[model samples]
Target: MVLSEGEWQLVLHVWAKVEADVAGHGQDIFIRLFKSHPETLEKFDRFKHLKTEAEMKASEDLKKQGVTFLTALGAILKKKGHHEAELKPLAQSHATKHKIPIKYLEFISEAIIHVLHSRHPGNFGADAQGAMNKALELFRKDIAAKYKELGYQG
Candidate 1:
């Protein structure tokens, strides 16, 4: 989906508001993802055992993982739907090496939605929400195709 100039502005504007606190928001996104689908934690051995609230929040490694997500989002947005280029290897590894479920991609999108809305209630309105949603959907689709290409039935 090609984001219009106005849509781009809307997304970039809201992103700027939260990008400063990437680690915090990233952590929140993961917390939401794990809470929403507890089984997804199994994808990471390090996070698999962090079932307790205290354990999940106290882990510096989780925060670092969150940074990776937000950082990936930043890179993807900069390229504007070109996940096939730089992000391809990451997707390949997740598909073949990690064997991540494709549905988890949608789960990540949901987590991003919750994080943005929770962090900036007024900023992520309909326009920004639609734009961001489509962008994330595209990201999900791109990786999903790669998973299929690699014959990863997971």
Candidate 2:
């Protein structure tokens, strides 16, 4: 769980743009995730029945849930990718209660990168790309540790 000083700076720079429209960016990330891999949507009980991206984008539930996802990202970033405790409870629920596959985390990471790059093509340059990639990797590693502790085969 390490992001260099420069990397952390780059990540925060891009994140500030995302925070400007938290709900909107959150929904875009999830929408990108679902569009990239439709199966990921099925894992969300509240959104699995939406049927179409248009439906999902329009649903108030999706907007709220999306904010939660963004909030988790913000919390992790606030810790500067150091603390696993921030994600421990989330891992417990997603691994056991939700029965979500660990691979979905990878998919979500991809969606995050995609959204950041697409939305801020100018600011999200090469350095930002690498920084975000490494940051998300740290998040996945920490959460995966919790999943392993829970005996989640996925």
Candidate 3:
């Protein structure tokens, strides 16, 4: 999507707001991910035995992992096209080391939607969705490209 440089800046600005603007700041997105894809939880022992309340809320491990996604979002926003530095290894770790497939990567976009819906209610309309979707699409493309290099023919 050949967004002009100015639009890219606008999209990046709007995308940055997602992490900051979640109203009550719920971690439900993570739990939602596990609920939505039960098999995904099994990818890492880090989440295999977790529940939304017992483990997801209390587990420091879950919290730490969530922070990295936010950090990656912020990092990518600050320096576009640097996911090789910010998100490549993280995505690679999940795919190669943890066996997460590219199909499952859509969970990130899912979480973005959940965040917008949960936080903004009626306020987060198309612009926010477009910004987040476009920004994430970039991450997705680059990460998928790297995985392709690793023989992920899918």
lDDT top scorer: 2
Please write out the lDDT profile of model 3 over residues 8-46, one tens digit for every residue.
665565555566733223355666777787777787587
Clashes of 2: 0
Q: Which stretches of candidate 2 lie over 4 Å from their true place?
A: none
List model 1 lDDT by residue over 19-44, tens digit each: 88998898899888998999899888
**Better lDDT candidate (2, 3):** 2
Q: Model 2 compared with the native: what TM-score?
A: 0.95
Which model, 1 or 3, shows the larger TM-score?
Answer: 1
Query: What do the candidate models score in CA lDDT, each in turn?
Result: 0.82, 0.88, 0.66
TM-scores for all candidates: the values are 0.92, 0.95, 0.78
State model 2's lDDT.
0.88
| Model 1 residue 66 lDDT score | 91
Cα RMSD of all models vs. native, in order, equals: 1.5, 1.1, 3.0
| Cα lDDT tens digits for candidate 2, 3-114 | 8899999999999899999999989998999889998888888768888878988999999999998988897897886666778788889998998887888999999999
Query: What are the clashing pairs of model 1?
Result: none
Error of 1 at 120 (Å): 0.8
lDDT, model 2, position 7: 93
